[PDB]
Coordinates of C-alpha atoms in Angstrom, one line a residue:
Chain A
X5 CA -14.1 18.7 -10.8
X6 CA -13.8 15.3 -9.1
X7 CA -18.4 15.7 -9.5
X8 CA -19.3 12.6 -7.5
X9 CA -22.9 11.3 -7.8
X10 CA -24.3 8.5 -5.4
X11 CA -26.8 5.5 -6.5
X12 CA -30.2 5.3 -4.8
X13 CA -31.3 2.9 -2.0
X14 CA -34.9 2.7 -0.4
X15 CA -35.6 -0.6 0.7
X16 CA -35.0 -1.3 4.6
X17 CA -35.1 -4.7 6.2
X18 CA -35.7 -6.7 2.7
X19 CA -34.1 -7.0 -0.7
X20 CA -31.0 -7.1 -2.5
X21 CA -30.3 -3.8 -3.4
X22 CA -27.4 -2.2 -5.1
X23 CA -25.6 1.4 -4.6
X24 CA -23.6 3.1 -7.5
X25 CA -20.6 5.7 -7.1
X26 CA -19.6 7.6 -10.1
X27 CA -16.4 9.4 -10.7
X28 CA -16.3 12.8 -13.0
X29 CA -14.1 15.1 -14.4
X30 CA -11.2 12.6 -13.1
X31 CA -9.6 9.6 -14.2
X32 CA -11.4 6.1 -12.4
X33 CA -8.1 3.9 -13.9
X34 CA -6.0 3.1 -11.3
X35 CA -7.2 4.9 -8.2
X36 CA -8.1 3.1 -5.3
X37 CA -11.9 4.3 -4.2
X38 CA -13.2 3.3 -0.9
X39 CA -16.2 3.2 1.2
X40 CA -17.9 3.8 4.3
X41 CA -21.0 3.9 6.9
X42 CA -22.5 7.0 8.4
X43 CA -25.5 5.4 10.6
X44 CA -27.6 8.3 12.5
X45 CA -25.8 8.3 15.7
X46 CA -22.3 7.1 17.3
X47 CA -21.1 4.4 15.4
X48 CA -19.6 4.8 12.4
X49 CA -16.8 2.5 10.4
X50 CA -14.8 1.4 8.0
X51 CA -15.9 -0.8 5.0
X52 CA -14.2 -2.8 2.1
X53 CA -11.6 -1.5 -0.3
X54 CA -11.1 -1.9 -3.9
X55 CA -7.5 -0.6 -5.5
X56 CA -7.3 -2.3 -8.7
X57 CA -8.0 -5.5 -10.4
X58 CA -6.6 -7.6 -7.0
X59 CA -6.4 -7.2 -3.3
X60 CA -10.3 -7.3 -3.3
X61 CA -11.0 -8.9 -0.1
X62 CA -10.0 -5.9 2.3
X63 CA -13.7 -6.8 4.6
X64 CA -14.4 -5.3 7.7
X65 CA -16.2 -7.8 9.9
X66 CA -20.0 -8.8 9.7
X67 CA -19.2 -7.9 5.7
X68 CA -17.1 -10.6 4.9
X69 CA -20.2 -12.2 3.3
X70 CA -22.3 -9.7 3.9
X71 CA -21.2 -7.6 1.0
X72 CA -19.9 -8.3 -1.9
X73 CA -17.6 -5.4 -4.3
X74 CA -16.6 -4.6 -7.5
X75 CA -15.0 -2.2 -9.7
X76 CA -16.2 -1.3 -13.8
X77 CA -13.8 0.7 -15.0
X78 CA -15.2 0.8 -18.4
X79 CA -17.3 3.4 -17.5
X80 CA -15.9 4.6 -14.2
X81 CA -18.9 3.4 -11.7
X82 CA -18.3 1.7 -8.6
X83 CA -21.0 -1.4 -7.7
X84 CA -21.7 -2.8 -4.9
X85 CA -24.1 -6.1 -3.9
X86 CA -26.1 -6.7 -0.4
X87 CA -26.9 -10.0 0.3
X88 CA -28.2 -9.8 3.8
X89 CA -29.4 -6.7 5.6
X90 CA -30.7 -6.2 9.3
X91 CA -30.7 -3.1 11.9
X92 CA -27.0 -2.4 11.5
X93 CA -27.4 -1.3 8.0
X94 CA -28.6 2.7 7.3
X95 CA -29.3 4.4 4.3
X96 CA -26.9 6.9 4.2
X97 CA -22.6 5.9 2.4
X98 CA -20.3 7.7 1.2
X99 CA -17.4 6.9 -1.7
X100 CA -13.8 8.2 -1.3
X101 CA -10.9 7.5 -3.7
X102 CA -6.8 7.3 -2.5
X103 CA -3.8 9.1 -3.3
X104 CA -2.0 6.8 -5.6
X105 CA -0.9 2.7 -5.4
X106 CA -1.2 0.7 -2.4
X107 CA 0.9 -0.3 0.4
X108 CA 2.2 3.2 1.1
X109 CA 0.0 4.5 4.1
X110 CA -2.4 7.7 3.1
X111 CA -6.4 7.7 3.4
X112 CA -10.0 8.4 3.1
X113 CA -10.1 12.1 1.7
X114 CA -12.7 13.9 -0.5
X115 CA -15.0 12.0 0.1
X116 CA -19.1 13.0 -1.3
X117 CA -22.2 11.2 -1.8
X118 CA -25.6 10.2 -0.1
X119 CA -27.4 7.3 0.2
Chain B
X7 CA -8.9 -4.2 16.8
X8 CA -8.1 -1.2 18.7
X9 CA -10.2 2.0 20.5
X10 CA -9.7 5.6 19.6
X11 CA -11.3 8.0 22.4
X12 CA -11.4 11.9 21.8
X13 CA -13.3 13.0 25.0
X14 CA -13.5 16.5 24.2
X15 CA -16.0 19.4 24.9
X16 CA -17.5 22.6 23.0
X17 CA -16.2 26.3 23.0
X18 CA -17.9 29.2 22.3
X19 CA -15.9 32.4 21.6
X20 CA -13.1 32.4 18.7
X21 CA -9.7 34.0 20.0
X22 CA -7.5 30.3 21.2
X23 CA -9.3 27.4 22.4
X24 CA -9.0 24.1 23.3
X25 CA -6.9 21.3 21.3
X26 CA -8.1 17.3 20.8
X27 CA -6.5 14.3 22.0
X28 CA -6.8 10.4 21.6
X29 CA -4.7 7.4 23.0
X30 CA -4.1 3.9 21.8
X31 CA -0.9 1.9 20.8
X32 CA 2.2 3.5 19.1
X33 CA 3.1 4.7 15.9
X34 CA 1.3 7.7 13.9
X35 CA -0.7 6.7 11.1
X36 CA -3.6 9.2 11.8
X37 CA -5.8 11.6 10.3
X38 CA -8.2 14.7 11.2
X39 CA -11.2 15.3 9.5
X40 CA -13.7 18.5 9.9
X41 CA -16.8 17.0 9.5
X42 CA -19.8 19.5 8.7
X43 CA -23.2 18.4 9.3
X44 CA -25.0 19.9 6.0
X45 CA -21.9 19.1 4.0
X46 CA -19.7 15.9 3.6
X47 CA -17.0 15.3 5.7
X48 CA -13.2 16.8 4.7
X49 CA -9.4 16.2 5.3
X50 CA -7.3 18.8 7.8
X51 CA -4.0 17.1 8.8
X52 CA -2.0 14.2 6.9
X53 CA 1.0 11.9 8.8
X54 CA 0.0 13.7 12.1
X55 CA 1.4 16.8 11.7
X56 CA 1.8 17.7 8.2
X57 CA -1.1 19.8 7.0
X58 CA -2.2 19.4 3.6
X59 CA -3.6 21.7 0.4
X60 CA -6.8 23.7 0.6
X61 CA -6.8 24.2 4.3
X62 CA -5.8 27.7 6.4
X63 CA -2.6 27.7 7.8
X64 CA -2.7 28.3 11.5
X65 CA -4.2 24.5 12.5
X66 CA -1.1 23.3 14.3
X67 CA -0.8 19.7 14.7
X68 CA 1.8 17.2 16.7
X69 CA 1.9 14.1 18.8
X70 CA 3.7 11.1 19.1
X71 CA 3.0 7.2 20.0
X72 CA -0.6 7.2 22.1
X73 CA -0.5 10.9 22.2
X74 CA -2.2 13.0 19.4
X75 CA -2.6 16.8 19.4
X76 CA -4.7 19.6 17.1
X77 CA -3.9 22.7 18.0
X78 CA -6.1 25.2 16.6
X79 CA -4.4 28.6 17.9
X80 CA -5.4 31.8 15.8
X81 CA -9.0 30.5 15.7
X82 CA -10.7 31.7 12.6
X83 CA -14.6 32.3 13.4
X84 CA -17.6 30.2 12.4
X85 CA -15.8 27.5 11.5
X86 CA -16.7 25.0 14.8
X87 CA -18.2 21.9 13.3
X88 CA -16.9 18.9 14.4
X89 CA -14.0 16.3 14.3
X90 CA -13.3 13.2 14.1
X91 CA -10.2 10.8 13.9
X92 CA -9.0 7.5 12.8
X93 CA -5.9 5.4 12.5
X94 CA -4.9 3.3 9.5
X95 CA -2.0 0.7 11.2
X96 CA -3.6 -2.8 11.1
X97 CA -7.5 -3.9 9.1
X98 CA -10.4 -3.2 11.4
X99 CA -9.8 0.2 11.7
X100 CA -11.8 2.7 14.0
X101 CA -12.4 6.1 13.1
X102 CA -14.7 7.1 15.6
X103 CA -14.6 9.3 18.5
X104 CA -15.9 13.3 18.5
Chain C
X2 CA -4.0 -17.7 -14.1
X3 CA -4.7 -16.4 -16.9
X4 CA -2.7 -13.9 -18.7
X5 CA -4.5 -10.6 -19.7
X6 CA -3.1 -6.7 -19.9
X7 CA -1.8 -5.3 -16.3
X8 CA -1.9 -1.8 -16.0
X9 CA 0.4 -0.1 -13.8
X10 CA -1.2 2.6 -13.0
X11 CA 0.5 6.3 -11.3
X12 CA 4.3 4.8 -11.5
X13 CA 7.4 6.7 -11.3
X14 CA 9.2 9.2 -9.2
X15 CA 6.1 11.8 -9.9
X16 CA 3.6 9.3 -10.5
X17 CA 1.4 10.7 -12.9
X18 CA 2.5 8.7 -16.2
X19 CA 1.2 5.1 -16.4
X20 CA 1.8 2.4 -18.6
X21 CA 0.0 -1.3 -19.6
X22 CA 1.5 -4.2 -20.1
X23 CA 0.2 -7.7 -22.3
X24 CA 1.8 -10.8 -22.5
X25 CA 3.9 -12.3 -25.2
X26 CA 3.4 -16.1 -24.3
X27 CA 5.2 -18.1 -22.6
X28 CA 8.6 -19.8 -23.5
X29 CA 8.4 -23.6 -24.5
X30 CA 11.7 -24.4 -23.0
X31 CA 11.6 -23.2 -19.4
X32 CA 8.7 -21.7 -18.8
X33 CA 9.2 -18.3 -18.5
X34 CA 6.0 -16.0 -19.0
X35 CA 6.9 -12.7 -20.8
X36 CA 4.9 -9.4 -20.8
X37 CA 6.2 -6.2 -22.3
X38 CA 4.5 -2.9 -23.5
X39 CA 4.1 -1.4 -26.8
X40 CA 6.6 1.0 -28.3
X41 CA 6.7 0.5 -31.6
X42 CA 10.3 -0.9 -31.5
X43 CA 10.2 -5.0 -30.7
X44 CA 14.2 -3.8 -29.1
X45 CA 13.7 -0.8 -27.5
X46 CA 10.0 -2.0 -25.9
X47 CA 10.4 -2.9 -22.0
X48 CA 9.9 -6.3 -20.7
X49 CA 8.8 -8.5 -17.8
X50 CA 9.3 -12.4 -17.1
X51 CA 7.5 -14.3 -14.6
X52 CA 8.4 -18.2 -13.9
X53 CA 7.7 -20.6 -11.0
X54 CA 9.4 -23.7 -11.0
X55 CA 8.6 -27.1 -10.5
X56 CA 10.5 -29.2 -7.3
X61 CA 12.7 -30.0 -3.3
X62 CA 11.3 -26.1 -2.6
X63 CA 9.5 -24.0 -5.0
X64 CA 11.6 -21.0 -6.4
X65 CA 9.5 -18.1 -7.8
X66 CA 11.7 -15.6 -10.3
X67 CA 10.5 -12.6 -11.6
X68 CA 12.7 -10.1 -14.2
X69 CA 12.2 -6.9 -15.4
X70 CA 14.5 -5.2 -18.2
X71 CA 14.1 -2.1 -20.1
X72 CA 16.2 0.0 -22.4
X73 CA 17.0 3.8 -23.0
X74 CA 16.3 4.8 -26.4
X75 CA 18.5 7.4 -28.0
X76 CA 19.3 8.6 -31.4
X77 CA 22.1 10.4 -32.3
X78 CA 23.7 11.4 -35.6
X79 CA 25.0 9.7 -37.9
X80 CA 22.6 7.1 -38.5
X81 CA 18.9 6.8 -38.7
X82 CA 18.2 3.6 -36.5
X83 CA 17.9 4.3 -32.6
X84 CA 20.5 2.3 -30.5
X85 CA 20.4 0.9 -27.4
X86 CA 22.7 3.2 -24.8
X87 CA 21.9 1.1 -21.4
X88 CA 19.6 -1.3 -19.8
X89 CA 18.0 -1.4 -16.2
X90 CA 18.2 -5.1 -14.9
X91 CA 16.3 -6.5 -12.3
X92 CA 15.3 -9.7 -10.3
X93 CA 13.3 -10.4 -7.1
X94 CA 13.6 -14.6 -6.5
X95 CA 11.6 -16.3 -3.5
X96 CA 12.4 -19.9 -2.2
X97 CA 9.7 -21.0 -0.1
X98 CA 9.7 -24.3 1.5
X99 CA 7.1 -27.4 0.9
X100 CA 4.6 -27.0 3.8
X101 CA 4.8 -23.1 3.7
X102 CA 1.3 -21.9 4.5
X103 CA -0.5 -19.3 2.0
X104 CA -0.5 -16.7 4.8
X105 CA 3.5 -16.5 5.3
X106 CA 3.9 -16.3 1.6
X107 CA 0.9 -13.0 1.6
X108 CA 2.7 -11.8 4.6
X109 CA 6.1 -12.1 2.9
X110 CA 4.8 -10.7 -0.8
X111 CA 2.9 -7.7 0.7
X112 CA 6.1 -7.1 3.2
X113 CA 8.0 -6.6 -0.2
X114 CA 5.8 -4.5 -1.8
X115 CA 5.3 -2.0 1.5
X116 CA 8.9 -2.0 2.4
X117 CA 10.3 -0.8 -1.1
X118 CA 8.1 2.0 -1.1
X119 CA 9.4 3.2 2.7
X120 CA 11.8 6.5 2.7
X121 CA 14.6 4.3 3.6
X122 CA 14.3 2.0 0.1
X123 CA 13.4 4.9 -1.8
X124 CA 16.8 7.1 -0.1
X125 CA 18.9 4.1 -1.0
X126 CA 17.6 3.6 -4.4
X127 CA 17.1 7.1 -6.1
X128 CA 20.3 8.5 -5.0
X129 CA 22.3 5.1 -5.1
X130 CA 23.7 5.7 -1.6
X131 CA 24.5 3.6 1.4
X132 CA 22.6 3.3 4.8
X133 CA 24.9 5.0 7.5
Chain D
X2 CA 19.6 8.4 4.2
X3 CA 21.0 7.0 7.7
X4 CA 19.1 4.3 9.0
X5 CA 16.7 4.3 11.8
X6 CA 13.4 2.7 13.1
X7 CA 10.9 1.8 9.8
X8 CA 7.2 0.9 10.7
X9 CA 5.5 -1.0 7.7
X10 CA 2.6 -0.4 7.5
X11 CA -0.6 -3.2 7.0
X12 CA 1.2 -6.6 5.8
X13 CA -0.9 -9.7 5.1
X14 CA -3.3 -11.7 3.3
X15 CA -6.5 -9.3 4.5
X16 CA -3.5 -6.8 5.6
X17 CA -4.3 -7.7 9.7
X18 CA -0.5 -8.1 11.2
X19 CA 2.2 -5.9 11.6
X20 CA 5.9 -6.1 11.8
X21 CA 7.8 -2.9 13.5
X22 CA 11.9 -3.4 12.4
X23 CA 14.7 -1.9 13.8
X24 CA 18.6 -1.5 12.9
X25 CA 20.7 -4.5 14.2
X26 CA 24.2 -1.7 13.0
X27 CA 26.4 -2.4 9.5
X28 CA 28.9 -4.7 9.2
X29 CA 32.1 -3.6 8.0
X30 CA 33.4 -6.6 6.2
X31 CA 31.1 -6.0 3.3
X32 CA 29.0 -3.5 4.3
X33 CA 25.9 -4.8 4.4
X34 CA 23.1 -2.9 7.0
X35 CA 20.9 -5.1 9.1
X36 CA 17.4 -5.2 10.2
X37 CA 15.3 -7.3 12.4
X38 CA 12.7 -7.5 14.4
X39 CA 11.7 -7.7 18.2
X40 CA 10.7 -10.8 18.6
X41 CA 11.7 -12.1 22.4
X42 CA 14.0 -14.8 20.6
X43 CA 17.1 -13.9 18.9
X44 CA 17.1 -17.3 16.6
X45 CA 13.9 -16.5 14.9
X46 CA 13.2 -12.9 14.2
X47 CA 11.9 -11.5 10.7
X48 CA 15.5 -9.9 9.6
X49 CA 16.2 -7.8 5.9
X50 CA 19.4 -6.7 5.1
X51 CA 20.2 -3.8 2.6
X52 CA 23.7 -3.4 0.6
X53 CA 25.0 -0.6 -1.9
X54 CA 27.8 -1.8 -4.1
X55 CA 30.5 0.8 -5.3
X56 CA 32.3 0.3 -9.1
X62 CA 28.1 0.4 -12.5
X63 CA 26.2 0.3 -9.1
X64 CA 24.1 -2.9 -7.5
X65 CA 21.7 -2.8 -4.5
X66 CA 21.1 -6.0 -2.9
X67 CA 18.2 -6.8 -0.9
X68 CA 17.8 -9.8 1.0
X69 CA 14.6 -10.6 3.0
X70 CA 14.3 -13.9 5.5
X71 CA 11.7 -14.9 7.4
X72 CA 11.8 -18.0 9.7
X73 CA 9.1 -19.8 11.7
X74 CA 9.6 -22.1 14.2
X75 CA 7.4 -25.1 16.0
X76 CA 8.1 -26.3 19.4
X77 CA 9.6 -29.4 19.7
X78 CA 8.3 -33.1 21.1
X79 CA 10.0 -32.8 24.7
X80 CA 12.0 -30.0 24.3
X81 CA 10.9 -26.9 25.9
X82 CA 12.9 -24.5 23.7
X83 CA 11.3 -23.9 20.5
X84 CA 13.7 -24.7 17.4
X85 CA 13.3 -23.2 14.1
X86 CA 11.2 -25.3 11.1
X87 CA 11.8 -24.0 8.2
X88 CA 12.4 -20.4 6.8
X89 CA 11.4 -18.4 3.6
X90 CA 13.9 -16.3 1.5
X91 CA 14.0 -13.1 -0.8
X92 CA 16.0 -11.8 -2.9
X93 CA 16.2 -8.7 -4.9
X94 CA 19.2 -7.4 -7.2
X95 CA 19.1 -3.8 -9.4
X96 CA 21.6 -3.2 -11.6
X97 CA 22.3 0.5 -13.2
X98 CA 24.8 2.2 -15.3
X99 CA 26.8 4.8 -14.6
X100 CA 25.2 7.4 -16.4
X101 CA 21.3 6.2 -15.2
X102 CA 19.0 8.8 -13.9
X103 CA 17.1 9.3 -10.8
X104 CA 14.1 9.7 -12.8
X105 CA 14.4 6.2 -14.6
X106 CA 15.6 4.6 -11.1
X107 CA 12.3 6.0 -9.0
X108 CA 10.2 4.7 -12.2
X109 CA 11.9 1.2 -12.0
X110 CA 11.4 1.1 -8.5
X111 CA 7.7 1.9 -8.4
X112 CA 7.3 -0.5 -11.3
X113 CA 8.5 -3.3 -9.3
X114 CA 6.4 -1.8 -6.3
X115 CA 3.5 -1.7 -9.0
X116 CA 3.6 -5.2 -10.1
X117 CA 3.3 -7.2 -7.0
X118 CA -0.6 -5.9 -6.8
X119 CA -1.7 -7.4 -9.8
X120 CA -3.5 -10.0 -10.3
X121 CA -0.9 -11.8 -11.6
X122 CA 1.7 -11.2 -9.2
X123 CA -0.6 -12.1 -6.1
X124 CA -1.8 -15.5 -7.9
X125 CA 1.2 -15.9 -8.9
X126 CA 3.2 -16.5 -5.5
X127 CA 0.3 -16.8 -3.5
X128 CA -1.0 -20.3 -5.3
X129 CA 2.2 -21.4 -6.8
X130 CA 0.4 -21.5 -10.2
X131 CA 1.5 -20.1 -13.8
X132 CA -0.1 -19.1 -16.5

């Protein structure tokens, strides 16, 4: 339950690119389902958030055009589109989902994925 | 905008140990998170010291504005890891520290 | 914008039910958008308005009503016991900025949900 | 279900700056509790004040928020203009908590639409 599955990146300083979260054995609907960056050692931040059909543009800064989100809910998958890439970005994210509407306060649990 | 420094060290016997701390402007909107290497990272403590479903009992947690505390009295055994912590008060966010 | 089906998602005191809304058009006369949520009753259904209005200073008034549906004996059509009212009006100025307006919208919608709203509305008693 | 200091949490366009409120006491003519925030000047501070009516109950809500430019000359600011709020909920007497706590998240609900947001945001119907 809550099976989470991760898209597949291997391209490094060139391309588009795209990355794909999956939710199973759960409801996508209303959830909000976040993001975030792993990078091999010390840093490691915060990205954009996505909670329903509005409050979109939640960027973290050198995203703001960076990266680009969006949420199917047709068929439960997250989606995500890089325009530019340089040495800041790795190939390892993770997708984590929220504990009910927004504007309450709670976090980044559970988590799962690869990159 | 804001920092979030742990500056904690490494243990290596299992009866009580050592607890975690951090320091930045007021106000506890804060998290734990036992992050195993192999594995994907985990939630321990919500609203500073209210832990939540799933997780042992004895992981005592308190603090207040620019002071946080884990206490992790009772130690269970091979359970080190490592931890991280973040706070969720204005956008750019930190989590970050170890 | 344009209208389309909201769906409030994880509502109520639980929050586990949820329920969508689509609009109904809006009103000729004044204006007022209207959205409401399928129950197969066109009287017992509950209902939303939207309307901004025109100028000195723009005023912004949203309702909400919905009804409790009960049968009892005696007859076979369900009646209308009580009604839950509602209305949240803003009155911005002219050369209000779109970042007061965010900052006063998203102020609303954190503050209602705070223990103190939620103490004061669920068991209908005073601050002290 | 006393009163006391209430952080909010992120409040904004991109959710960036914060507003900490704390009681200003209740006024005893009507009964109406006060908010308001620390703001160094007692003429401009983000203030929200809460009421409970007694009998078919009403809350009253009333949020204002003024900002203020410094004048041409004058070297104490004086308030421009102000924004205002209000919210009224009306129950029976025999209303339940369960149908009170799912009108209230409704209204909390709504205001993340899209609708909602473009709504007040852009000053534009549908």
């Amino acid at each position: 339950v809550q099976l989470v599955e991760s898209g597949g990146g291997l391209v490094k300083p060139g391309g588009s690119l795209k990355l794909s979260c999956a939710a199973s054995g759960f409801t996508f609907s209303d959830y909000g389902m976040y993001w975030v960056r792993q990078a091999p050692e010390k840093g490691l931040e915060w990205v954009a958030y996505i909670g329903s059909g509005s409050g979109v543009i939640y960027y973290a800064d050198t995203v703001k055009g960076r990266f680009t989100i969006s949420r199917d809910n047709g068929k439960n998958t997250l989606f995500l589109q890089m325009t530019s890439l340089r040495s800041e970005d790795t190939a390892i994210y993770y997708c984590a989902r929220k504990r009910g509407y927004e504007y309450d306060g709670q976090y980044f649990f559970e988590y799962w994925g690869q990159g | 905008m804001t920092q979030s420094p742990a500056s904690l060290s490494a243990s290596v016997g299992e009866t009580v140990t050592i607890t975690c701390r951090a320091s930045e402007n007021i106000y506890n909107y804060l998290a734990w998170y036992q992050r195993k290497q192999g594995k994907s990272p985990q939630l321990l403590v919500f609203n500073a010291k209210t832990l939540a479903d799933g997780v042992p009992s004895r992981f005592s947690g308190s603090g207040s504005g620019t002071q946080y505390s884990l206490k992790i009295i009772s130690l269970q055994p091979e359970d080190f890891g490592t931890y991280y912590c973040q706070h969720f008060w204005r956008t750019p966010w930190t989590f970050g520290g170890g | 914008a344009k209208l389309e089906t909201v769906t409030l998602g994880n509502i109520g005191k639980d929050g586990k039910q949820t329920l969508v809304l689509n609009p109904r058009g809006v009103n000729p006369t004044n204006g007022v958008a209207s959205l409401s949520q399928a129950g197969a009753v066109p009287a017992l259904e509950k209902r939303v308005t939207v309307s901004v209005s025109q100028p000195k200073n723009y005023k912004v008034q949203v309702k909400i009503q919905n009804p409790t549906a009960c049968t009892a004996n005696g007859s076979c059509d369900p009646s209308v016991t009580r009604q839950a009212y509602a209305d949240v009006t803003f009155s911005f100025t002219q050369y209000s900025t779109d970042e007061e307006r965010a900052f006063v919208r998203t102020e609303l919608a954190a503050l209602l949900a705070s223990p103190l709203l939620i103490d004061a509305i669920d068991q209908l008693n005073p601050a002290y």
